[PDB]
């Protein structure tokens, strides 16, 4: 029909929204073992019984884990079996024929979910759909046990039955490009933002201080992040797949772990730096020189390199479970599978250790400020808001991820992958917030103004 826009009128795209794609065996809202896209394996409470039925369906030993090719093949087999079930029934076909293309799909949806004989149970609802009494059948279907158990999916199917359009599912496409344009802005803010910082310290001589030498490091880790990590990361999420190969999958992963670790550990260095620069400024100016500070930065990148490129390129970070082995064998799969060891080891070094130091240091700052050689002034209240933003932002961005990252492995995943990738991006945008936190100095202000002549 000359239709190559994104969304179309079909049962296939409809079910994919209702039933997510999961390669490993899981349990539905009922509790039955299911794999792929809503493919029921068995009602048997035994997982081994589900594995046997699964291996008899695929034709090989799957270990409860299949591939995308096998998932799609089962999906079309199930949809075809749903349609062939509708056509072979006495109650379904008289209704199915008398339905438009859209409403036909809505009927297949129910059959895809609760079987041929189950949907035929709806004597009243089907008669009403047959006499084109949509609004009455919409109300009647909302009184079934199918509605009480899966109210979200039912409400969408019932709506499609009512309107006769894809209004309940077409709202998914707006969010597709809707989050794409957001990612498009995130990349720009990080790249252009950190380049501005680096350019300022590199050009102007007044911005060449020890603290700013640490700022340069932070701006460097965030820049590469916005040039390597963030773009390639978004490029896959939108396209649903990874189209660069296995070699660049881990290399891009290596850059990720590298830059993120270097970024957070630098935030830690800056925090300690500003402690000594304030608490003991006279010793701070004498002890810590540019040479010494260059050694500190070098140490940070080595630690970051030791916890990123070193384990990854040596396949040490790799997990062993069947779903991980497949992705390591797949050229289109670049998921981040790790073992308990690397997941904890990285998190402690990348996030937790700097987190502890940054909190303890900034606490001492608020502590040793009360004990000085000195009555309810507002200069201390404003300074309190500052550290609340510095530390609060870093917390609100990375903490949700690394907590989940540690829960992601302590037990078999009860936390959705959708949440896992989302919380990584909340950490990703911290690399954009940094220049808006660590470059508000009057010297940076004047530098930023002249760098673009505003």
């Amino acid at each position, epitope marked *: 029909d000359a239709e190559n826009l994104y969304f179309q009128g079909n049962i296939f795209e409809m079910l994919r929204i209702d039933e997510g794609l999961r390669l490993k065996i899981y349990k539905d809202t009922e509790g039955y073992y299911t794999i792929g896209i809503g493919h029921l394996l068995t009602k048997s409470p035994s997982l081994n019984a589900a594995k046997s039925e699964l291996d008899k369906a695929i034709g090989r030993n799957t270990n409860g884990v299949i591939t995308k090719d096998e998932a799609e093949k089962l999906f079309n087999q199930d949809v075809d079996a749903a349609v062939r079930g509708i056509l072979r029934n006495a109650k379904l076909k008289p209704v199915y024929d008398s339905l438009d293309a859209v409403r036909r799909a809505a009927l297949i949806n129910m059959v895809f979910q609760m079987g041929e004989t189950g949907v035929a149970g709806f004597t009243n609802s089907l008669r009403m759909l047959q006499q084109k009494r949509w609004d009455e059948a919409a109300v009647n279907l909302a009184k079934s046990r199918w509605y009480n158990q899966t109210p979200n999916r039912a409400k969408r199917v019932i709506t499609t039955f009512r309107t006769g359009t894809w209004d309940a599912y077409a709202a998914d496409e707006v969010w597709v490009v809707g989050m794409g344009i957001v990612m498009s802005l995130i990349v720009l803010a990080i790249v252009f933002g950190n380049v501005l910082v680096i350019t300022a310290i590199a050009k102007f001589e007044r911005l060449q201080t020890v603290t700013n030498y640490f700022i340069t490091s932070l701006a460097c880790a965030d820049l590469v992040m916005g040039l390597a990590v963030v773009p390639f990361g978004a490029a896959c999420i939108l396209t649903k797949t990874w189209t660069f190969g296995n070699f660049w999958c881990e290399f891009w992963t290596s850059i990720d772990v590298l830059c993120v670790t270097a970024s957070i550990e630098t935030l830690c260095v800056i925090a300690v730096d500003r402690y000594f620069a304030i608490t003991s400024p006279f010793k701070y100016q004498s002890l810590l020189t540019k040479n010494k500070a260059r050694v500190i930065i070098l140490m940070v990148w080595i630690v970051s390199g030791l916890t990123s490129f070193l384990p990854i390129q040596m396949h040490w970070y790799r997990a062993t479970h069947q779903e991980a082995i497949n992705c390591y064998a797949e050229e289109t799969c670049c998921d981040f599978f790790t073992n308990q060891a690397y997941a904890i080891a990285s998190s402690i070094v990348s996030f937790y250790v700097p987190l502890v130091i940054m909190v303890f240091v900034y606490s001492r700052v608020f502590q040793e400020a009360k004990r000085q*050689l000195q009555k309810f002034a507002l*200069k201390e209240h404003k300074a309190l808001k500052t*550290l609340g933003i510095i530390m609060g932002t870093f917390t609100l961005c990375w903490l949700p991820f690394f907590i989940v990252n540690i829960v992601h492995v302590i037990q078999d995943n009860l936390i959705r992958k959708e949440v896992y990738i989302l919380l990584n991006w909340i950490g990703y945008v911290n690399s954009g917030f940094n220049p808006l936190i660590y470059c*508000r100095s*009057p010297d940076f202000r004047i530098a930023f103004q002249e760098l673009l002549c505003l």
Partner: nanobody, 120 residues
């Protein structure tokens, strides 16, 4: 929007003693560095003496042993004892306050400046 009141500068004979003063009127963050800077005729602005809010001090290599900096107990007023003055100490002494309320950086306050002349 705070103020700095300088006082003390004047004419003295070579070797004579002089006392400077700088009252910091306004609200300053607890952690700070008050001190003094000078501009000798035909020379860049140099650090004379500076005292942190934590009592510790710092002097230049050309004044250490002759100049003694100190501060009041609660009035935020820094006094600069200047003894055994030299004709090369003749300069424009500015008052200075390093605020740390921004944590990441340090905002600077300055004074009107005082003229100190030593008759060679």
């Amino acid at each position: 929007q705070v103020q700095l009141q300088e006082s003390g500068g004047g004419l003295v004979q070579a070797g004579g003693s002089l006392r400077l003063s700088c009252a910091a009127s306004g609200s300053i963050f607890a952690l700070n560095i008050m001190g003094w800077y000078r501009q000798a005729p035909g020379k860049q602005r140099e650090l004379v003496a500076a005292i942190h809010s934590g009592g510790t001090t710092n002097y230049a290599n050309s004044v250490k042993g002759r100049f003694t900096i100190s501060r009041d107990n609660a009035a935020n007023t820094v006094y600069l004892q200047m003894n055994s003055l030299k004709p090369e100490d003749t300069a424009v002494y500015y008052c200075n306050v390093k605020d740390f309320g921004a944590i990441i950086y340090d905002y600077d306050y300055w004074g009107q400046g005082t003229q100190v002349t030593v008759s060679s």
